[PDB]
Structures are given as C-alpha cells and as structure tokens.
Design a protein around this ligand. Structure first.
Ligand SMILES: [K+]
Ligand SMILES: [K+]
Ligand SMILES: [K+]
Ligand SMILES: [K+]
Ligand SMILES: [K+]
Ligand SMILES: [K+]
Ligand SMILES: [K+]
Ligand SMILES: [K+]
Ligand SMILES: [K+]
Ligand SMILES: [K+]
Ligand SMILES: [K+]
Ligand SMILES: [K+]
Ligand SMILES: [K+]
Ligand SMILES: [K+]
Ligand SMILES: [K+]
Ligand SMILES: [K+]
Ligand SMILES: [K+]
Ligand SMILES: [K+]
Ligand SMILES: [K+]
Ligand SMILES: [K+]
Ligand SMILES: [K+]
Ligand SMILES: [K+]
Ligand SMILES: [K+]
Ligand SMILES: [K+]
Ligand SMILES: [K+]
Ligand SMILES: [K+]
Ligand SMILES: [K+]
Ligand SMILES: [K+]
Ligand SMILES: [K+]
Ligand SMILES: [K+]
Ligand SMILES: [K+]
Ligand SMILES: [K+]
Ligand SMILES: [K+]
Ligand SMILES: [Mg+2]
Ligand SMILES: [Mg+2]
Ligand SMILES: [Mg+2]
Ligand SMILES: [Mg+2]
Ligand SMILES: [Mg+2]
Ligand SMILES: [Mg+2]
Ligand SMILES: [Mg+2]
Ligand SMILES: [Mg+2]
Ligand SMILES: [Mg+2]
Ligand SMILES: [Mg+2]
Ligand SMILES: [Mg+2]
Ligand SMILES: [Mg+2]
Ligand SMILES: [Mg+2]
Ligand SMILES: [Mg+2]
Ligand SMILES: [Mg+2]
Ligand SMILES: [Mg+2]
Ligand SMILES: [Mg+2]
Ligand SMILES: [Mg+2]
Ligand SMILES: [Mg+2]
Ligand SMILES: [Mg+2]
Ligand SMILES: [Mg+2]
Ligand SMILES: [Mg+2]
Ligand SMILES: [Mg+2]
Ligand SMILES: [Mg+2]
Ligand SMILES: [Mg+2]
Ligand SMILES: [Mg+2]
Ligand SMILES: [Mg+2]
Ligand SMILES: [Mg+2]
Ligand SMILES: [Mg+2]
Ligand SMILES: [Mg+2]
Ligand SMILES: [Mg+2]
Ligand SMILES: [Mg+2]
Ligand SMILES: [Mg+2]
Ligand SMILES: [Mg+2]
Ligand SMILES: [Mg+2]
Ligand SMILES: [Mg+2]
Ligand SMILES: [Mg+2]
Ligand SMILES: [Mg+2]
Ligand SMILES: [Mg+2]
Ligand SMILES: [Mg+2]
Ligand SMILES: [Mg+2]
Ligand SMILES: [Mg+2]
Ligand SMILES: [Mg+2]
Ligand SMILES: [Mg+2]
Ligand SMILES: [Mg+2]
Ligand SMILES: [Mg+2]
Ligand SMILES: [Mg+2]
Ligand SMILES: [Mg+2]
Ligand SMILES: [Mg+2]
Ligand SMILES: [Mg+2]
Ligand SMILES: [Mg+2]
Ligand SMILES: [Mg+2]
Ligand SMILES: [Mg+2]
Ligand SMILES: [Mg+2]
Ligand SMILES: [Mg+2]
Ligand SMILES: [Mg+2]
Ligand SMILES: [Mg+2]
Ligand SMILES: [Mg+2]
Ligand SMILES: [Mg+2]
Ligand SMILES: [Mg+2]
Ligand SMILES: [Mg+2]
Ligand SMILES: [Mg+2]
Ligand SMILES: [Mg+2]
Ligand SMILES: [Mg+2]
Ligand SMILES: [Mg+2]
Ligand SMILES: [Mg+2]
Ligand SMILES: [Mg+2]
Ligand SMILES: [Mg+2]
Ligand SMILES: [Mg+2]
Ligand SMILES: [Mg+2]
Ligand SMILES: [Mg+2]
Ligand SMILES: [Mg+2]
Ligand SMILES: [Mg+2]
Ligand SMILES: [Mg+2]
Ligand SMILES: [Mg+2]
Ligand SMILES: [Mg+2]
Ligand SMILES: [Mg+2]
Ligand SMILES: [Mg+2]
Ligand SMILES: [Mg+2]
Ligand SMILES: [Mg+2]
Ligand SMILES: [Mg+2]
Ligand SMILES: [Mg+2]
Ligand SMILES: [Mg+2]
Ligand SMILES: [Mg+2]
Ligand SMILES: [Mg+2]
Ligand SMILES: [Mg+2]
Ligand SMILES: [Mg+2]
Ligand SMILES: [Mg+2]
Ligand SMILES: [Mg+2]
Ligand SMILES: [Mg+2]
Ligand SMILES: [Mg+2]
Ligand SMILES: [Mg+2]
Ligand SMILES: [Mg+2]
Ligand SMILES: [Mg+2]
Ligand SMILES: [Mg+2]
Ligand SMILES: [Mg+2]
Ligand SMILES: [Mg+2]
Ligand SMILES: [Mg+2]
Ligand SMILES: [Mg+2]
Ligand SMILES: [Mg+2]
Ligand SMILES: [Zn+2]
Lengths: 50, 87, 155
RNA sequence: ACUGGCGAGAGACCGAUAGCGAACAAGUACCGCGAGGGAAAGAUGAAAAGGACUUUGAAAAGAGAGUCAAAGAGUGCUUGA
RNA sequence: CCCGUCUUGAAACACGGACCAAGGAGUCUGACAUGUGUGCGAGUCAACGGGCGAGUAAACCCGUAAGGCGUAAGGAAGCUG
RNA sequence: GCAAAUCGUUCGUCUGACUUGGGUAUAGGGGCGAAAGACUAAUCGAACCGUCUAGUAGCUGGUUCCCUCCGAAGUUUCCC
RNA sequence: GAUGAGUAGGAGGGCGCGGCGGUCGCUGCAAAACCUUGGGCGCGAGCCUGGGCGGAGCGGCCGUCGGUGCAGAUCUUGGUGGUAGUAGCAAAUAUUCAAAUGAGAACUUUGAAGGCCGAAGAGGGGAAAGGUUCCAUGUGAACGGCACUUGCACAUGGGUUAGUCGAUCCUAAGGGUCGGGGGAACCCCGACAGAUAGCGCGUCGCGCGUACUCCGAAAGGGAAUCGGGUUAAAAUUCCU
RNA sequence: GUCUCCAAGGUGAACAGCCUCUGGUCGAUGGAACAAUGUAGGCAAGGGAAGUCGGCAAAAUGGAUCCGUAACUUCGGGAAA
RNA sequence: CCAACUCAGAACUGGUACGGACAAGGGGAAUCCGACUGUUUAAUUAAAACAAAGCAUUGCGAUGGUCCCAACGGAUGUUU
RNA sequence: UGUCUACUAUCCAGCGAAACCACAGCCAAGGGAACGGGCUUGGCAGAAUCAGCGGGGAAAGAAGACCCUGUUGAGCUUGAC
RNA sequence: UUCACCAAGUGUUGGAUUGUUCACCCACCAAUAGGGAACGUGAGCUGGGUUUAGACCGUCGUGAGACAGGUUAGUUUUACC
RNA sequence: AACGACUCUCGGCAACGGAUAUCUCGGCUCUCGCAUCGAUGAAGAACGUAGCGAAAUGCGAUACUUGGUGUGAAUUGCAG
C-alpha cells in the first residue's frame, strides 16, 4: 500500500533491480552456460511473499 | 462458504519478516519468530528435521570471519610483522 | 534440407518448405490432400476460391463431425468439406515461394504441377484451460511442417 | 572414539530415471499464513571457421550459395531406438 | 474365444491391463544344521597382537603353560569317573 | 460448472440477543461451542508439520532366461 | 535294449548382462550402439554373418564376482495415441456508417449515430493487500482460451519533493519485563515477597519522592495551510 | 469473496422499480440459418386439482380513499380479519 | 403586498378506461408441536432441536464454594 | 396438447479439451463360473458419412460405507480388567 | 346364466383413502381377465416409503445406546465413444 | 464392385520423441593427517558494491578490491 515501511520499500527496490534480462555480452563469454535469467518475476504471476 | 468465498478474506498478516533470520515467519501477535524463535537468545533447532538443520547451518551463508581462520592457523596466528622488503 | 521424396528430374523441379507453422495439422493435411498432382495454375485458383468460399476442401480422414456442403460433392461424393482459409493461406504462400524459385532456375512456370506435397506434425505448443472443481487441463496447439515440390510437365 | 570442520590419498562403487535432493546461478526455481515441502535441468565442432552474398516474402522463413573431414554436426546442435 | 491372477471351476456379465521406452522384487549379515569340495588330523585354527613387506589396506613369518572347538562322561549338587 | 457450494426467481430478519472493520485474549485430548460432535486456514467423533518409520499385517497385488528329468496335496494330531 | 503327460514343487545341464584376475584378439583401410523384405545355425534361451548408419572404442576363451534377465504389481518416471477438429465459445440488452493508419482491421484511433450503467453507479476517492501494475516511446516471438496495428505483455527510459497530510506522541483491551517466587533446563507467574524512577527550587546544596520514563490505534485522544497556477506521469508536498 | 466516504432531475410514501443529466461505457470471439431436445420468458377455447405422495409450479390478491369487520382473547390483540 | 401545497366538492368528457407501465397481502374453518423475538449442522437436515423470561433444587460467610496450575501461584473477585 | 420470443443445439471462420480404452463391437437358441461381442448350431452380411437417441455394452465415477472374517483400530459408556 | 371347443385379431377405463405392491369403495362400460420381459423400465423421470448424519415419543438398558415401533427434516452425478 | 475415397496391412523416405552406445571439473564408500568460532562482536540475516551485471562467486563507501611478498607479461565477451 501507499503506507509502507522503509524496510519493505528497500526490499522492493532490490527486487526491481533483479528483475531484468541478462546482458547480451554474458552469452558470448568463453565456456558460458547462462542462457537467460532463470529468476525472472512478474508481479501478477508470482508474489513476493512479504 | 468455507471454500472460495472464505479465501476472499486474506488481508491481515499473521507473520512478517524476521529481523534475525529474514523469513516471513515473525508472528506479530506472539512477537515470536516461528523459524528461529527470535527474540529468544538461542536459535530454534530440532534434531527431528535433518533438512531444516542443513538449510540454516554454518557454511550455508557467507562465513565472513570464520573462512579466514584456517589461513591464520597455518601461520600460527602471526601478527605485527611483515615480509622483508624486496631487494 | 532433405525432402521425403526426391523429384525424378532435379533440374526441372523446384521446391519450398515451411516448419512449425501455427496452423492446425489436420486441416492442413486435408488441404494438401486435395492439391496433390494438380497444375500450379489450377491449384492457385482453387485455393483462392476456398478463401472466397466458392470451392470447398473435402475432408476424408479427419472428418468426424464435419458438416456437409454441396461445394464438395464433385470431389467427395458424401459431401463432407470445409473452407480452412488459414491452411490455404500458408500453402498459398509456399506455392508462391516455389514459383519464385522456378523463375530463378528458368523453368516453364505454365507447365508446373504439384508432384509432391506432405504435412508432418510439428512440436506441440502448450497452454492450459481451467475446468470445474479447480482442475487444470492441457490446451494444446498442433502446428505442422509443410514441404512441396513442383515439377515441369514433360512432353 | 570420530557419517561435523579443514587438508590428503584410495576404490572389483554409480555413470545423468544411476550416484547425495543437488555433475548445471540446488537447498536454487516454485508451493505453504506457518512449522515445513522442494524439483527439473550435462555432450555443436579439432577450431565459430556460428552460414557472406543473390533472389522470394510484411515478417518468421524458404530457394540457391558459402564454412567444415561432416551440416546426413546449424547455438537444448554427438549418436538418435 | 484374452492374457495375467485367486479359484473345485475363467472366454466369462470375477479383478489388473489404452500404447512405448527405461527403472522395477528371496538380498546382505549373525547363529545353527545337513550335504559336498579342500587342507591337516588327536588334534585343528596366524583369529587380538607382534615381526614385516609389493616404498607396501595385499602377500610372507610368529602360539613361548594364550584362547576356541575337539580329546570323557554322569549328577541338582557335594562328588565320582 | 462462472464457481471444490456458484446462478436465477422465491423467501427470513431489518433499532436489536442488530450488522460490521481493526486491535486483542483462548491452541490439539487442548481451545471455543444459544449444543449441530458444531467450529479451530477447502483438514475435526481429536487439526496441521517433521520425526520415531522401510511402524506391524495369519490379508490383497506383483515376483524378470531356456531346455531336460522327477513330481504332489486339500488328509492325521495339536493350537483363543 | 527299454522308454517320453504334468500345476504346486525340487534338481541338472545350458543361454544372456556388467566387473575383476589371466589369456587370445579386433579397430579411423571404421569400434560400440542402432536400422534392415539380406543369409544361416541351434528343440530353445540365443548365436554367427551381408548391407546401412555412426565416428572411437570393443570382443572371444578360462577362472571368479554381482545392484545380472520383465507384459502385468489401479507398478515408478518420461513419452505417445484413439477419443477429436469432437464436447465446447451462449449470464451482465448493441451495435452501425464514414474516414485515417497498417502487409493485414467485425476487434486500433477520430468523427457521426443508436443503446447501457442511472448518484447504495459500470461515476469520483481512500483503508487493507499488491509492488512499478503508474507515464512516454517502441516491438521478432510468446502471452491477453477468436483476432489485434493492440497491452495491466515484452524492450528502453522517465516518474513519488511536506515545520502545517500521516507515521512519530498518548493511553485502551492487552503485550513484554526488573526484583521476588517457581523450574533439571527450555521455561512459568508478572511490579505479587523490593534501598523506584527521579522531579522541583537555588547554586553543589535544600525540598519532594506510592517499584515499570517499556510496547500496544495510518478509524480512539491529538500543536499549525489556505486559495490560484503548474506535469506525458507528482503535489493541502512543486510555483506564486 | 473483500472495510468505508461523496450521491443530481422526473414519477412516487420512498437512496423501491422505470426513464434521464454529470461522469463512464458498448469490455464480454464473430458470421449464416430458425430442425428436434433443452434453458429462460409467455399465452390459451370449455372444464377447474379430475393431475400428483402432496396444489410442486404457476395463476389469482396487491397501492390509496370511504364504508364495514366475527369467533376467540392473557383485553394488549385477532385486523390489512 | 407576498405566498407554498395539502384536503374536500361540482360540471363536462373518452370504445367503463383510469394504483392503465412499474410497483404491490390470496383469503377462510381446524388439528399437532414450540409460548413469543432470538440461535443452529460453512458445503444434503432451519426444525418440534438449542436459547429464552418464568419456576425449582444444590453448594458456599473468605481458615470459604466452583475452577485452573509441573511448581509457584491464579480465575470467579474493582466480588460478599 | 398447441403456439410465440430469446439463448443454445445446428452450419461456418478461428480456437480447442477431458472422462474412458485387454482386443473389440448385428442377432436367436444352446452349453458354459447356472444372464456371451467372441465358443457350438443357425439367422444373415455391401464402401464412406450427418443429426438425434438413451435398449444394451451386467457403461463411467470409487480397492462396498451394508453384511461377515481379522487373535486390526478408533469415538463413546459402565457393575469389564 | 352355466359347462366345454377353435381362438391372443381388437379391447380391458375415470375416481376417493393409502408411499405403497395388495386392498377397498364410488361410477362408467361390450368387458373393466390374469401374467412375463434382470420381481421390464432411476446416465427416462419422480423420491412419497425404505435405508447415513439433526430431532421427538413409547418400551428396553445403570449407561453409552437399542427397537423386521411410530414421527418430522434430509444434494438422485456423466454420453461427445 | 473397375477407378478413386476410407480402413487395415507391408516397405522406402520424412516426422514425433529422447531410449541405447561412448563420455564426466559430480556422487558414493574406505583410509589418513590436523585441532583452528564468538562481547577484540561469531554463525546467520540484510543492504550495497564493476566502464558496460541480473544470478552465482568476491568484496564493504579503500566495496569482483587496498597493501606486502612471490611469480615475471598479461586480462579478454566488448570497450578503453
Ligand atoms: K457435422
Ligand atoms: K533428483
Ligand atoms: K554428427
Ligand atoms: K486374483
Ligand atoms: K473372485
Ligand atoms: K478384466
Ligand atoms: K589347542
Ligand atoms: K605368537
Ligand atoms: K541326582
Ligand atoms: K431485505
Ligand atoms: K490431537
Ligand atoms: K489367518
Ligand atoms: K579380456
Ligand atoms: K543382421
Ligand atoms: K565373466
Ligand atoms: K488501499
Ligand atoms: K512531518
Ligand atoms: K493515531
Ligand atoms: K473516545
Ligand atoms: K498554495
Ligand atoms: K429449439
Ligand atoms: K389434487
Ligand atoms: K425480529
Ligand atoms: K477462592
Ligand atoms: K469452427
Ligand atoms: K445362454
Ligand atoms: K473416532
Ligand atoms: K440410461
Ligand atoms: K427443509
Ligand atoms: K497403403
Ligand atoms: K548413456
Ligand atoms: K560486526
Ligand atoms: K595481493
Ligand atoms: Mg492474485
Ligand atoms: Mg511462500
Ligand atoms: Mg473447515
Ligand atoms: Mg491474529
Ligand atoms: Mg511485539
Ligand atoms: Mg455436434
Ligand atoms: Mg473453464
Ligand atoms: Mg478454484
Ligand atoms: Mg574428520
Ligand atoms: Mg539425480
Ligand atoms: Mg544409464
Ligand atoms: Mg566426438
Ligand atoms: Mg542429434
Ligand atoms: Mg467361487
Ligand atoms: Mg484366465
Ligand atoms: Mg456370465
Ligand atoms: Mg480382488
Ligand atoms: Mg481397467
Ligand atoms: Mg528393463
Ligand atoms: Mg562340512
Ligand atoms: Mg591352553
Ligand atoms: Mg557319588
Ligand atoms: Mg462465461
Ligand atoms: Mg492447558
Ligand atoms: Mg453462535
Ligand atoms: Mg448425534
Ligand atoms: Mg505427518
Ligand atoms: Mg518392505
Ligand atoms: Mg490355549
Ligand atoms: Mg515329461
Ligand atoms: Mg559382455
Ligand atoms: Mg520391419
Ligand atoms: Mg558373447
Ligand atoms: Mg555394480
Ligand atoms: Mg535388480
Ligand atoms: Mg515394460
Ligand atoms: Mg508375469
Ligand atoms: Mg498402469
Ligand atoms: Mg504415466
Ligand atoms: Mg490424449
Ligand atoms: Mg462444436
Ligand atoms: Mg455454456
Ligand atoms: Mg453465436
Ligand atoms: Mg451478453
Ligand atoms: Mg466488442
Ligand atoms: Mg436497467
Ligand atoms: Mg437507462
Ligand atoms: Mg449513503
Ligand atoms: Mg488468442
Ligand atoms: Mg498503462
Ligand atoms: Mg513488464
Ligand atoms: Mg496533522
Ligand atoms: Mg492494561
Ligand atoms: Mg515471556
Ligand atoms: Mg528474575
Ligand atoms: Mg508494591
Ligand atoms: Mg512514554
Ligand atoms: Mg507507544
Ligand atoms: Mg486518529
Ligand atoms: Mg496523481
Ligand atoms: Mg412527489
Ligand atoms: Mg429512486
Ligand atoms: Mg384454459
Ligand atoms: Mg376462458
Ligand atoms: Mg370455479
Ligand atoms: Mg386427487
Ligand atoms: Mg390419480
Ligand atoms: Mg392421496
Ligand atoms: Mg407454491
Ligand atoms: Mg384469523
Ligand atoms: Mg386436542
Ligand atoms: Mg419457536
Ligand atoms: Mg450458520
Ligand atoms: Mg447443511
Ligand atoms: Mg437448508
Ligand atoms: Mg410455567
Ligand atoms: Mg500448587
Ligand atoms: Mg444372443
Ligand atoms: Mg462382453
Ligand atoms: Mg458363426
Ligand atoms: Mg457397413
Ligand atoms: Mg443423451
Ligand atoms: Mg444404455
Ligand atoms: Mg469396467
Ligand atoms: Mg474391497
Ligand atoms: Mg474400502
Ligand atoms: Mg488382523
Ligand atoms: Mg482366528
Ligand atoms: Mg481399542
Ligand atoms: Mg390380446
Ligand atoms: Mg419371478
Ligand atoms: Mg426390476
Ligand atoms: Mg436404465
Ligand atoms: Mg438416477
Ligand atoms: Mg425404480
Ligand atoms: Mg423421502
Ligand atoms: Mg436419521
Ligand atoms: Mg430407564
Ligand atoms: Mg420421512
Ligand atoms: Mg568473483
Ligand atoms: Zn527468524
């Protein structure tokens, strides 16, 4: 809600940063096996649980 | 009404985030974490959950300080000295 | 790459293929079954008439529950037929692509006929649908691979 | 004495549905208010040399061509029931 | 007549089985017993341990009043044998 | 099935033992019950989670290669 | 020379799988696996071989060993059919015309018309709960159970401004506690077994002094902000 | 399923129903036919519960004004008899 | 001089139509049960079941009655 | 019994499941585990397909809750131990 | 009117009370015969009865509870093969 | 009762699927050595940190590292 604590807002900020595609140059490294971001989260599909 | 209709009333949180363990397990009214028993001084651990023990035991985290003890032991915890300057 | 059947005269034939096309396999098979051994000019007009609902594509194998129409009696006596425009659209594009390949090879387009055409099932795509009593069932699509070969009519 | 910790050697052991749950961003993704529950997922090639260019198509892509011993190895690609 | 199965009796209006791949069930250990193979024989057994040794978890050696089983039985026992 | 209890019409009550939000107290042989063994997170004539646990089963099901030879019993006695 | 049935059951001789100790070999002039309307051997388990595919390992024989042989277990995991282009898309009155844009328009946008919600609303806000879904631009696929040029999807960037609005302060039901009393201990009771906290006034001294300076309300109590204007998205917060 | 604030005009006793203004919206995949059976909504000659376990379902009554209102009664009611 | 809308009556008039849509009791004579209002088996039973006011019985004057607690203590009790 | 309206069904474009499935699917009698789609003897029997239908498939849904057995429980009761 | 023969072609009804099968009565009629088809027929209906869980009475039992005794309320699923 | 459709069947090819074979910076088992957490703030939790990074790994506003020493010419997906 609009009324939120500082602690919760900080946690939500970190989750937004983590919810991005992997950089393209990561897949061109030597011996790379990372195909995509396996931890992508959508606000409507999976909830944060807090 | 016990089924779908009852699930519509889910806007009061029993648990919040624990200050100590970070799980959404801090029972608000009991002021007690169901995961680590915070604010009790001793952590919550039970031998009847082998999996629970190994999820939270030493080494599952950062080992910020304990990771460097073996290195210092090999040198006999030497301190207050430095390698001789290169010639 | 490799087609299930090779043309008798590779120099006098052209070909085109499509993979994982989002169109019903069963509908596309019926459309292909109606075009086999057909002149290219007639096949194109026949498919255009299907898009205009003037000619029907008979359904012979995957025909359970298919309606009956007079437009299919000439090719299918019992009258089972339909107008699968989506299947016709994909096949029409393939015919045009094969025709362009013929022009590059300098073939006689007027004498071309469909010497080979087949539809294969592609990988199924997965969605889901919601059922009574909180149950989830599969909601799948059935795409198909299409390959065709046009050969010149030898005198 | 020693199925923990750190370091080391070994085996008539398992060989990706096996072997630890986990050979891989695995106690991860995900589920549960919570105590807890808990997966799937390894293999291009010697070397990316990862397919220039022509032509058709709105595009995906196809046709021809090109690289390679091999595309009948073409980025979930060895073999392929 | 359809296989598998329990049954006096199954093609059964008895049950399991839509189809394919792979996984999938008398094992290990202790005690005893009969039988058989082998060694030695009124003896037998290197078993805890020691001496060593393929630089060595093996192999080889060691039983000096050790110990186990056997070499004598009967009796509740004192005992006799 | 829109739905693991909903939809339509029809119905009970509607200033009170009235309806309702949030806060707070009561926890498993315990709670709570204007009492139906009701309710205690779709779980209640004893919740849920892990463990003891690979619990025991005179009962049901299954129990994996080939030929060759021999080849039964449903009878006796005793047994909660 | 005689003789031949066999469930439950017993036994013998053999087949096959994977290691180990040995021994004899094969293989990039093509091993394993797999495929075959090729051929042959054995009563049979199986075995040998032609051709194909594949591209780096493998086999025979003696002994010895074992997580060693499947059609079934409403068997386990994975995959795949028939059913079937079938059941099905039907509540909440409703769309139509023209033009623009686009490869593509019953579904996007503009205009016109015809309807609906009808102020206890299908309107305008907020508390919980969610957490970027907000705004702009763009978009291959997937997704929005038809479609989409569309977007609560995807990609890039932007966005939340307070002495006056709240939290914060106060106390409520209650919660957490000192000392004390219990308790093997985890814990139980909770200001009840006690030299309280300190405060006030002078300038360190006098006076007072009944055991919690604790937590507990974004609907209870409560110091103070009003117009006008401003953004693609913010305001009783920015500007005047 | 989920707490609460603001609440126009007409009809009318009325934040009843019906229609309208502000604001919002045509979002429920579309097209063509008009069989049976179905779901929802109706109507019907004459008879009027003969139907059926049973008047289930439906129909009938319904607002307001004036008149009038029995048994019984705890004297309050019954009564909108 | 300025007023709002309640009531009552009369004439005339329409194919007797007029609470014209919407809205909105069927009525009566009895039997059984429960006095009534209230409550109840969330998701097959709403009732004659529960509760209820009224009535009656029982314990107890605090060194107490009833009850909780492993122990210490505590609820009724800010009570009589 | 008839008839009227709407939405379905029906036909089309697009989209698109599941239950269930030994193999399968025309009958009569016979015998049979005493009620066969299969066996015996007969009747017969002609591609493919559409809309409906509830006779049969002893149809599906679930290791009968009734009853009995087990040296299985559990709730409750008391003059059981 | 009775007995018997060929004879199953046609017909064998409307109601009160009862969940009933059965029965009984009223009335009509030429007549109101008797039966089978998994005691035909619940994916055809209906659910009155019986036969879960709520509740009341009587009798029985110290009690929990019992009653081929009475009473009232009690979800009837799926076809597209 | 041709042809063709349909169904079934056999073969070639193409699909579907991921078995088999060959692999393995992993697992499992045995043996050996060592004794070293924390109020001098541990284990654990949170947030931040790179020219281009989300995770994993590393690190702590000196933040994928400072300093000393050793080694002696790279790092590398791109840029500089
Ligand atoms: K049809
Ligand atoms: K696993
Ligand atoms: K290859
Ligand atoms: K059986
Ligand atoms: K049986
Ligand atoms: K069977
Ligand atoms: K001896
Ligand atoms: K010795
Ligand atoms: K004696
Ligand atoms: K009401
Ligand atoms: K319990
Ligand atoms: K037995
Ligand atoms: K060998
Ligand atoms: K062969
Ligand atoms: K061997
Ligand atoms: K809110
Ligand atoms: K403030
Ligand atoms: K407040
Ligand atoms: K107040
Ligand atoms: K201002
Ligand atoms: K109809
Ligand atoms: K009647
Ligand atoms: K009332
Ligand atoms: K007391
Ligand atoms: K269609
Ligand atoms: K028969
Ligand atoms: K019980
Ligand atoms: K039926
Ligand atoms: K009822
Ligand atoms: K064929
Ligand atoms: K393998
Ligand atoms: K610290
Ligand atoms: K360094
Ligand atoms: Mg949600
Ligand atoms: Mg969760
Ligand atoms: Mg419940
Ligand atoms: Mg709570
Ligand atoms: Mg607290
Ligand atoms: Mg149909
Ligand atoms: Mg659905
Ligand atoms: Mg649901
Ligand atoms: Mg150790
Ligand atoms: Mg594994
Ligand atoms: Mg394997
Ligand atoms: Mg290789
Ligand atoms: Mg491959
Ligand atoms: Mg029997
Ligand atoms: Mg049998
Ligand atoms: Mg039978
Ligand atoms: Mg059985
Ligand atoms: Mg079965
Ligand atoms: Mg196998
Ligand atoms: Mg012996
Ligand atoms: Mg001795
Ligand atoms: Mg003697
Ligand atoms: Mg709908
Ligand atoms: Mg207690
Ligand atoms: Mg209550
Ligand atoms: Mg009861
Ligand atoms: Mg459990
Ligand atoms: Mg077992
Ligand atoms: Mg005895
Ligand atoms: Mg024999
Ligand atoms: Mg072998
Ligand atoms: Mg074959
Ligand atoms: Mg061999
Ligand atoms: Mg092994
Ligand atoms: Mg095995
Ligand atoms: Mg198998
Ligand atoms: Mg078997
Ligand atoms: Mg199975
Ligand atoms: Mg399966
Ligand atoms: Mg299927
Ligand atoms: Mg349909
Ligand atoms: Mg529908
Ligand atoms: Mg329609
Ligand atoms: Mg509608
Ligand atoms: Mg629309
Ligand atoms: Mg309306
Ligand atoms: Mg309106
Ligand atoms: Mg209001
Ligand atoms: Mg769509
Ligand atoms: Mg938006
Ligand atoms: Mg997004
Ligand atoms: Mg304020
Ligand atoms: Mg208080
Ligand atoms: Mg406490
Ligand atoms: Mg203390
Ligand atoms: Mg005191
Ligand atoms: Mg304070
Ligand atoms: Mg406070
Ligand atoms: Mg306030
Ligand atoms: Mg705003
Ligand atoms: Mg008025
Ligand atoms: Mg109104
Ligand atoms: Mg009538
Ligand atoms: Mg009439
Ligand atoms: Mg009348
Ligand atoms: Mg009647
Ligand atoms: Mg009748
Ligand atoms: Mg009657
Ligand atoms: Mg009625
Ligand atoms: Mg009356
Ligand atoms: Mg009486
Ligand atoms: Mg009452
Ligand atoms: Mg209730
Ligand atoms: Mg109920
Ligand atoms: Mg009810
Ligand atoms: Mg009285
Ligand atoms: Mg005590
Ligand atoms: Mg028959
Ligand atoms: Mg049968
Ligand atoms: Mg025959
Ligand atoms: Mg036929
Ligand atoms: Mg039907
Ligand atoms: Mg039937
Ligand atoms: Mg069956
Ligand atoms: Mg059974
Ligand atoms: Mg059972
Ligand atoms: Mg038993
Ligand atoms: Mg017995
Ligand atoms: Mg018991
Ligand atoms: Mg007759
Ligand atoms: Mg009979
Ligand atoms: Mg019957
Ligand atoms: Mg039937
Ligand atoms: Mg039925
Ligand atoms: Mg019946
Ligand atoms: Mg009934
Ligand atoms: Mg009952
Ligand atoms: Mg009595
Ligand atoms: Mg009854
Ligand atoms: Mg790092
Ligand atoms: Zn915690």
């Amino acid at each position: 809600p609009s009324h939120k604590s500082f602690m919760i807002k900080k946690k939500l900020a970190k989750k937004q940063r983590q919810n991005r595609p992997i950089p393209y140059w990561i897949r061109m490294r030597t011996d790379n096996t990372i195909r995509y971001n396996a931890k992508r989260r959508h606000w409507r599909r999976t909830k944060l649980g807090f | 009404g016990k089924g779908t209709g009852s699930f519509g009333k889910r806007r009061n949180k029993t648990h919040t985030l624990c200050v100590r363990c970070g799980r959404r397990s801090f029972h608000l009214q009991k002021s007690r974490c169901s995961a680590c028993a915070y604010p009790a001084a001793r952590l919550r651990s039970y031998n009847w959950s082998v999996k629970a023990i190994r999820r939270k035991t030493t080494g599952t985290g950062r080992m910020r300080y304990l990771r460097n003890v073996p290195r210092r032991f090999k040198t006999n915890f030497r301190e207050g000295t430095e390698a001789a300057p290169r010639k | 790459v490799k087609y299930s059947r090779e043309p008798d005269n590779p120099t006098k034939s052209c070909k085109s293929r499509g993979s994982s096309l989002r169109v019903h396999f069963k509908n596309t098979r019926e459309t292909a079954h109606a075009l086999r051994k057909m002149p290219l000019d007639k096949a194109k007009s026949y498919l255009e008439d299907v898009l205009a609902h003037k000619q029907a594509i008979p359904f012979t194998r995957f025909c359970r529950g298919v309606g009956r129409t007079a437009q299919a009696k000439n090719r299918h006596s019992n009258g089972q037929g339909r107008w699968p425009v989506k299947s016709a659209g994909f096949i029409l594009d393939l015919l045009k692509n094969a025709e362009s390949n013929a022009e590059v090879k300098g073939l006689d387009v007027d004498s071309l006929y469909i010497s080979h055409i087949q539809v294969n099932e592609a990988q199924k795509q997965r969605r889901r649908t919601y059922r009574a009593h909180g149950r989830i069932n599969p909601y799948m699509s059935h795409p198909c691979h299409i390959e065709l070969i046009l050969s010149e009519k030898e005198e």
